[PDB]
Ligand SMILES: *[C@@H]1O[C@H](CO)[C@@H](O[C@@H]2O[C@H](C(=O)O)[C@@H](O[C@@H]3O[C@@H](C(=O)O)[C@@H](O[C@@H]4O[C@H](C(=O)O)[C@@H](O)[C@H](O)[C@H]4OS(=O)(=O)O)[C@H](OS(=O)(=O)O)[C@H]3O)[C@H](O)[C@H]2O)[C@H](O)[C@H]1O
């Protein structure tokens with residue numbers, strides 16, 4: 535319990551910026567650039 | 583315990599302060615770029631201007647059928663492109679807004695010719711004069727003796743220069759006049 | 762069991778079989794992450 539609780543609080547994703555392609559007159563994609571927060575461990579982006 | 587409880591909360595508080603410090607600096611980042619751009623463009627609006635040196639036109643039969651303007655850089659202005667610029671024509675008949683027609687005689691458009699300089703559309707230097715060419719019988723009817731025209735040469739940045747072109751009282755025995 | 766202290770009623774909702782749009786005073790669970798759609802196995806499971 536002690537290990538998992540600290541992992542819950544600390545392991546976090548930080549979003550740097552967001553951009554998307556635009557065709558004709560409508561945004562057809564939404565892309566984000568993410569990074570792990572301060573002191574975080576390995577963050578798998580499939581179980582997320 | 584209180585020792586265990588304190589450490590977990592302390593971990594959260596530095597993260598919260600990190601987020602709080604994050605928004606403050608980044609918001610200042612956007613305001614920096616927006617502020618700097620506003621200062622430059624506003625300064626360019628006041629400074630970059632056009633001065634009309636003199637105006638003249640051809641005389642056929644008994645009607646001034648061209649209006650030619652000799653423009654020059656204003657005091658302290660930067661490059662003045664004459665294609666992205668526009669000129670208003672409040673004549674005795676029509677009241678339209680002319681634009682650049684690349685190469686012409688020009689219907690409802692104006693042309694340049696470069697009196698002096700290394701460009702025929704840009705006022706790069708301070709000593710370079712460009713001739714703005716305007717067709718009278720194309721934008722409207724051929725000007726008659728007395729018909730005054732009001733012209734405002736609007737630069738891209740927004741600065742305006744107004745010149746009132748007044749055809750001489752009598753057009754007898756003269757091939758060209760000074761409007 | 763889920764207790765619904767709402768603005769009008771106040772009941773205790775129990776689970777019902779896969780019956781959406783007809784779920785009266787019951788609640789239904791549709792899986793979001795995982796193989797099981799009624800039980801949370803590991804930390805990565807998410808159920809709606
Ligand atoms: C969010 O981020 C995603 C990241 O993928 C991004 O998605 C891409 O957007 C591209 C564009 O719309 O910006 C798409 O580009 C097209 O497909 C590429 C590829 O095939 O996937 C490239 O394809 C070649 O294009 C040439 C060209 O002459 O058109 C064609 O001969 C042929 O379709 C392809 O030939 S190839 O290169 O020999 O394979 C090309 O883009 S490029 O690689 O940047 O030059 C585009 O045709 C891309 O498919 C898409 O996944 C979103 O846009 C973001 O919002």
Ligand SMILES: *[C@@H]1O[C@H](CO)[C@@H](O[C@@H]2O[C@H](C(=O)O)[C@@H](O[C@@H]3O[C@@H](C(=O)O)[C@@H](O[C@@H]4O[C@H](C(=O)O)[C@@H](O)[C@H](O)[C@H]4OS(=O)(=O)O)[C@H](OS(=O)(=O)O)[C@H]3O)[C@H](O)[C@H]2O)[C@H](O)[C@H]1O
Pocket residue numbers: 638639640641648649650687695715
């Ligand atoms: C305002 O500024 C504009 C700037 O364009 C100016 O426009 C010009 O005005 C000239 C004149 O009316 O002052 C026009 O001149 C005529 O056309 C020229 C050219 O063809 O465009 C020249 O034409 C030749 O002249 C010979 C000559 O012996 O007279 C003739 O054989 C024949 O007309 C033409 O033969 S050619 O060259 O083989 O084609 C001539 O003017 S010139 O070049 O100055 O000597 C005139 O005939 C000119 O067309 C027009 O753009 C306005 O006048 C200003 O008010």
